[PDB]
Design a protein around this nucleic acid. Structure first.
Ligand SMILES: Nc1nc2[nH]cnc2c(=O)[nH]1
Ligand SMILES: [Mg+2]
Ligand SMILES: [Mg+2]
Ligand SMILES: [Mg+2]
Ligand SMILES: [Mg+2]
Ligand SMILES: [Mg+2]
Ligand SMILES: [Mg+2]
Ligand SMILES: [Mg+2]
Ligand SMILES: [Mg+2]
Ligand SMILES: [Mg+2]
Ligand SMILES: [Mg+2]
Ligand SMILES: [Mg+2]
Ligand SMILES: [Mg+2]
Ligand SMILES: [Mg+2]
Ligand SMILES: [Mg+2]
Ligand SMILES: [Mg+2]
Ligand SMILES: [Mg+2]
Ligand SMILES: [Mg+2]
Ligand SMILES: [Mg+2]
Ligand SMILES: [Mg+2]
Ligand SMILES: [Mg+2]
Ligand SMILES: [Mg+2]
Ligand SMILES: [Mg+2]
Ligand SMILES: [Mg+2]
Ligand SMILES: [Mg+2]
Ligand SMILES: [Mg+2]
Ligand SMILES: [Mg+2]
Ligand SMILES: [Mg+2]
Ligand SMILES: [Mg+2]
Ligand SMILES: [Mg+2]
Ligand SMILES: [Mg+2]
Ligand SMILES: [Mg+2]
Ligand SMILES: [Mg+2]
Ligand SMILES: [Mg+2]
Ligand SMILES: [Mg+2]
Ligand SMILES: [Mg+2]
Ligand SMILES: [Mg+2]
Ligand SMILES: [Mg+2]
Ligand SMILES: [Mg+2]
Ligand SMILES: [Mg+2]
Ligand SMILES: [Mg+2]
Ligand SMILES: [Mg+2]
Ligand SMILES: [Mg+2]
Ligand SMILES: [Mg+2]
Ligand SMILES: [Mg+2]
Ligand SMILES: [Mg+2]
Ligand SMILES: [Mg+2]
Ligand SMILES: [Mg+2]
Ligand SMILES: [Mg+2]
Lengths: 123, 209, 56, 125, 114
RNA sequence: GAUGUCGGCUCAUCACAUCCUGGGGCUGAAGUAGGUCCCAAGGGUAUGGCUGUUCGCCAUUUAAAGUGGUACGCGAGCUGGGUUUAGAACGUCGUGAGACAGUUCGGUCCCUAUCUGCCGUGGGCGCUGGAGAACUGAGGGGGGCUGCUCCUAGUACGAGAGGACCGGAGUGGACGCAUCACUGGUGUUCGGGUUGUCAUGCCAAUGGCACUGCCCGGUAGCUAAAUGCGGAAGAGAUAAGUGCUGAAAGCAUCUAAGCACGAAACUUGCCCCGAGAUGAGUUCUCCCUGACCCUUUAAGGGUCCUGAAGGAACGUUGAAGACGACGACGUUGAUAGGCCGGGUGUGUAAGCGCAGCGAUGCGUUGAGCUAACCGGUACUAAUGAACCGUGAGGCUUAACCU
RNA sequence: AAUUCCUUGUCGGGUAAGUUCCGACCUGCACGAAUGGCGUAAUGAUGGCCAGGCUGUCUCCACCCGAGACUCAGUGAAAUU
RNA sequence: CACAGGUGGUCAGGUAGAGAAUACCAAGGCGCUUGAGAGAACUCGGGUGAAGGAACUAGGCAAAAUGGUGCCGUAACUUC
RNA sequence: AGGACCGAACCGACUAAUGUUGAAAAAUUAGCGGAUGACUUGUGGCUGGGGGUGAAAGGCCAAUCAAACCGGGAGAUAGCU
């Protein structure tokens, strides 16, 4: 449950450390982005020699949230923080080559197959 | 197709073999007894009037009692009508069970919604509250403007204002029929239906796809 | 906010058309003491449904 | 809304209500009959009747629990020594409300609330 | 309520082992891993238990790649294949929410040896 | 002898010169995507950075971010940042008091709603004897949005790049209603921990006060962030438009006669109200079967006797409620409280015993306590009774029957 | 610029985006030396701007506790007309 | 006005505390001269709040937050 | 030592909400500044209306001060309503 101004951690090796949600994509007046949703982000903090820089405006897929995901039996999987994976603005494909921390099977799509394969754990 | 009268028992869930939890409303559908058959010749329209449940003899008035006596049925908690289709035919004193819904895929469920009493514009009409701070004076959940000026010089009919919320006839459409069991007097529908536990429900096959 | 026009004695009476009191119609007599009383209430001498329930 | 809720607020806060019913439960145990408003007599049953139920089993723990709810050892002594045995075989309903007048000063509906098998000797002394 | 109770107990698991808050539990869950259907283990501390007949649940907390993961299991769900206590934990509270503010050495729970 | 100014907030309502979605003609329209005009007002129609701003520029969205009217809509609805008071300063002008339609810092926003209007909710009487229900449906209101992916099909089209119509499937955004089973929030009425202090004689155990003293949890209910469902399809008549047959006018011509199509607008279809629909409708059932007197003699007035069905009253009350209303129950009784058993929540009470110098630990013990919950149970309270409402129901004509 | 009309001047910085802010330029409509000029540590319920923490300020409002509002009894106003 | 306003001096118990702050009490004085119910909107005054965390607004207005003692340690600049 | 620091009494009055036919003709509540000094306060005294007093706001001079209040000239005058 991510909105504009939300700060997220980064679940990849793009070089980004802290990103802010500047837009929840996918609809007019669309309020929140959850696990699996694409967001528009600004880089607030980045490592000295990464794939991205502080101030860069791009996209990201949300992979972990404090609100978590519901499963068809009524179950919930929640995370201690909100994390995202940086995506190229046009291709909407990952910038990084490695994924950190667990991800959920909700990413099982043709476009986020790379994220589930790279992830250490899939819940 | 005709519908039946029931009672909202409450909600539970049905767990499936593929790990799905279906939220269900338990509806008690006891036999519905035909108290009157309305035809074109006598009434100008075709329908069945039904009763269900039981009523204390000391609460059944003489006018009520005579109407049940004519049908040859015991007194029920009330009377409800269902319009007949062409080809649909019933008889006075006939019993209709929940099995009517056996091969009915979706139903429309009517109930009297829970009463919220006198409700403000925020609860009743989802009006947005004004500032909690920033100098607001006595005007947080208050409705704001209710009109324009000298043109039109009046508030319009239908203006969203505070008033009685709930405790009214509400129909929830196209609910999936999960289970029918005449032996247990049961109908399980997927999702929530209007009303409180113990209140009467009208169940009819879905009017839409 | 205040009236622009003085309301009438007619109007006053119309407003008051629901103000009349209702006389109690629910008085019973105790079978033992013979005292009048409000239904479901004890009598002045402390009788209720023919029995002396309060010694006052 | 107030849907399925129990307990009268009585234009008081929580700690005042509790203090008052602790006093009023003591008054009824002591005198065996009291005159109060109809809503207060109705609320009182919910405080005094579980006290008599507790007094049906004499133990140090039950006496201490009754003391925590009454803070009067004369009241806990009468509960366990007199009322507990007197009501031993009665399954609830140890009290009775008898509706009476209207209070002169404010037109409040009054009621008498008494212990079902009243001792006129204990009431006088 | 009697009708609901009857509909509920016929769906209730009979073999639920006894576990309590602070215990380390391993839940074996049915998952669809692409085109495959296998059992997946989720081991961690029971931080909450909701005892509610058919609506019973339990919250299991684990540390994955330095960050906390909480899973709320619906006890009577066919998705939950088995539950086994791996370690008995000694705690005073029903709800171990204070463990969310604890990391590594501070989040350790003593073993219940009785 | 006062009609409060800009902008914002809240709440809107109309127009159409239409922003999107829908239909269509022309295109310098291959496709995709556009341009322009016609038809169309059903719904839908961003959040931010800067500034008092409206606007505007900029960032990032969106199917789209419409243009206008409504006292440049809306202060007896809110704000008070801009802007006309009094303080003060700078630049400029003036000898000066002062001045600026220059800038700058600071700077009191009242009104308990009588009438109209509107949102809710009652009381009265009427509908022609009275009464209890179930309805018919005139009329009124609500709703009406849309993305993306997939299949058709890498097809038609195209040198390629790219890439459809028609039709079908799925899944979302926003909006709306309902519900509390799940996930949670709350839960000063449940359980526990703890600080300071005062009391219950003291120990131990408890209680008061300090924001519920401060906290950790949490039942029922309420509830959204939770999870169900909805917008439709279809039908009728159309708009712009496309046509068939066809004269006037030997031909031609969608039109004059005749005929076929055609849109999110319109009428239906869906949801809610609804016979005060005084044009007061229909159906089923229930109840009432005594005399007398008087006058201006008539649909007249009154008296005695009668008092039904039903309604109400009183009481116990409700997931019903401001009050009223509405629903359940009243001993031939589960309506409320209590009581019993369970569940739930808290998390192993007290007392005693053991271990330790002690704090404290261990055992008895998942203990004790447990609201609004579930299943039961007449222990308490729901009294035999009373009040309102009557006593066979107008005239005319017709049709049956006497 | 508490001074600059044109003006949101231009350039740089900060922000995803900055009519304000900070640094710089000089084209000072209309700075300038006790009408004091330019600085200046400390001080300030002083004006402008940025950040961390924090949060119902807001997305967007939910539940709860109290005092009114509502009902009964007693007393009993007002402006206006 | 039996009015939440104003009015100079003196006295200074216990526990905790730096204290005449503050909390609980003693002596002593009081419950404030309409009450009874109910538990709607809305207003006032409070408590708790998922995910987010200034996106609010003219402006963080209001809230929330910080808060004690000891020791360690502490930058530019400075009139030292 | 200090118009030193933090902070009650005491003196003041920066912000907000409430109240605005008020509990109050300027307050209440939560916060705020000074708190050994150009401090604060009691009792009594002196200055008087074109006059006083003023760390200066045209502030204050007995609840409206760019000329107090009361009585008088007085029935000022009013080409105005
Ligand atoms: N006591 C009593 N019981 C009833 N049951 C049905 N009506 C009544 C009534 O009026 N009184
Ligand atoms: Mg009915
Ligand atoms: Mg209700
Ligand atoms: Mg808002
Ligand atoms: Mg005000
Ligand atoms: Mg307010
Ligand atoms: Mg107005
Ligand atoms: Mg008009
Ligand atoms: Mg009161
Ligand atoms: Mg207290
Ligand atoms: Mg208690
Ligand atoms: Mg006038
Ligand atoms: Mg047009
Ligand atoms: Mg043109
Ligand atoms: Mg429109
Ligand atoms: Mg566009
Ligand atoms: Mg205007
Ligand atoms: Mg106002
Ligand atoms: Mg100006
Ligand atoms: Mg000035
Ligand atoms: Mg009709
Ligand atoms: Mg002790
Ligand atoms: Mg109707
Ligand atoms: Mg022990
Ligand atoms: Mg029990
Ligand atoms: Mg007669
Ligand atoms: Mg900013
Ligand atoms: Mg500068
Ligand atoms: Mg009164
Ligand atoms: Mg007084
Ligand atoms: Mg006083
Ligand atoms: Mg003083
Ligand atoms: Mg003090
Ligand atoms: Mg008083
Ligand atoms: Mg209230
Ligand atoms: Mg929060
Ligand atoms: Mg939180
Ligand atoms: Mg933060
Ligand atoms: Mg902003
Ligand atoms: Mg804004
Ligand atoms: Mg502040
Ligand atoms: Mg605070
Ligand atoms: Mg000093
Ligand atoms: Mg103060
Ligand atoms: Mg200070
Ligand atoms: Mg100080
Ligand atoms: Mg003096
Ligand atoms: Mg003269
Ligand atoms: Mg004169």
């Amino acid at each position: 449950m991510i909105q504009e101004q939300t700060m997220l951690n980064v679940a990849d090796n793009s070089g980004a450390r802290r990103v802010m949600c500047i837009k929840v994509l996918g609809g007019s007046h669309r309020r929140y982005a959850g696990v699996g949703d694409i967001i528009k982000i600004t880089i607030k903090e980045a490592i000295p020699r990464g794939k991205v820089k502080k101030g860069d405006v791009l996209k990201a897929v949300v992979v972990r949230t404090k609100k978590g995901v519901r499963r068809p039996d009524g179950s919930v999987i929640r995370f201690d923080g909100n994390a995202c994976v940086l995506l190229n603005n046009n291709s909407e494909q990952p910038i990084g080559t490695r994924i950190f921390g667990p991800v959920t099977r909700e990413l099982r799509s043709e476009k986020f197959m790379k994220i589930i394969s790279l992830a250490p754990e899939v819940l | 197709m005709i519908g039946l009268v029931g009672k909202k028992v409450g909600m539970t869930r049905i767990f499936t073999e593929d790990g799905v939890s279906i939220p269900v409303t338990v509806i008690e559908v006891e036999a519905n007894r035909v108290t009157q058959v309305k035809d074109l010749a006598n009434d100008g329209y075709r329908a069945i009037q039904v009763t269900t449940g039981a009523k204390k003899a000391n609460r059944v008035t003489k006018p009520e009692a005579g109407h049940f006596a004519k049908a040859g049925v015991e007194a029920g908690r009330g009377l409800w009508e269902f319009r007949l289709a062409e080809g649909e035919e019933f008889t006075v004193g006939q019993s209709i069970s929940v099995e009517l819904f056996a091969d009915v895929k979706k139903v429309d469920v009517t109930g009297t919604s829970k009463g919220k009493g006198f409700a403000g514009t925020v609860k009743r009409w989802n009006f947005r509250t004004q500032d909690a701070t920033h100098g607001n004076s006595l005007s947080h959940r208050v409705p704001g403007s209710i009109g324009q000026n000298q043109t039109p010089g009046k508030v319009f009919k239908g203006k969203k204002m505070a008033g009685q919320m709930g405790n009214e006839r509400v129909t929830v459409q196209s609910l999936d029929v999960v289970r029918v069991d005449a032996e247990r007097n049961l109908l399980l529908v997927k999702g929530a239906v209007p009303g409180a536990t113990g209140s009467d429900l009208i169940v009819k096959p879905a009017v839409k796809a | 906010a205040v009236q622009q026009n003085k309301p009438t004695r007619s109007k006053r009476g119309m407003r008051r058309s629901h103000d009349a009191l209702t006389a109690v119609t629910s008085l019973s007599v105790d079978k033992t003491s013979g005292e009048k009383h409000l239904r479901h209430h004890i009598t002045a001498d402390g009788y209720y449904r023919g029995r002396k329930v309060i010694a006052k | 809304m107030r849907h399925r809720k129990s307990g009268r607020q009585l234009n008081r806060n929580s700690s005042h209500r509790q203090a008052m019913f602790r006093n009023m439960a003591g008054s009824l145990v002591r005198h065996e009959i009291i005159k109060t408003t109809l809503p207060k007599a109705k609320e009182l049953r919910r405080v005094v009747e579980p006290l008599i139920t507790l007094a049906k089993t004499d133990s140090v723990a039950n006496r201490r629990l009754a003391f925590a709810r009454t803070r009067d050892n004369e009241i806990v002594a009468k509960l366990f020594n007199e009322l507990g045995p007197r009501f031993a075989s009665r399954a609830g309903g140890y009290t009775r409300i008898l509706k009476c007048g209207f209070r002169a000063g404010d037109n409040a509906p009054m009621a008498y609330i008494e212990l079902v098998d009243r001792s006129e000797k204990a009431e006088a002394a | 309520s009697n009708i609901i109770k009857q509909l509920e107990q016929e769906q209730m698991k009979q073999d639920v082992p006894s576990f309590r808050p602070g215990d380390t539990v391993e839940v074996k869950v049915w998952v669809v891993e692409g085109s495959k259907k296998r059992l997946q283990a989720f081991e961690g501390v029971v931080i909450a238990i909701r005892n509610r007949g058919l609506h019973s649940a339990f919250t299991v907390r684990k540390i994955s790649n330095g960050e906390g993961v909480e899973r709320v299991f619906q006890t009577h769900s066919p998705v939950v294949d088995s539950i086994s206590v791996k370690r008995r934990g000694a705690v005073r509270k029903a709800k171990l929410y204070y463990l969310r503010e604890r990391t590594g050495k501070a989040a350790r729970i003593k073993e219940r040896l009785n």
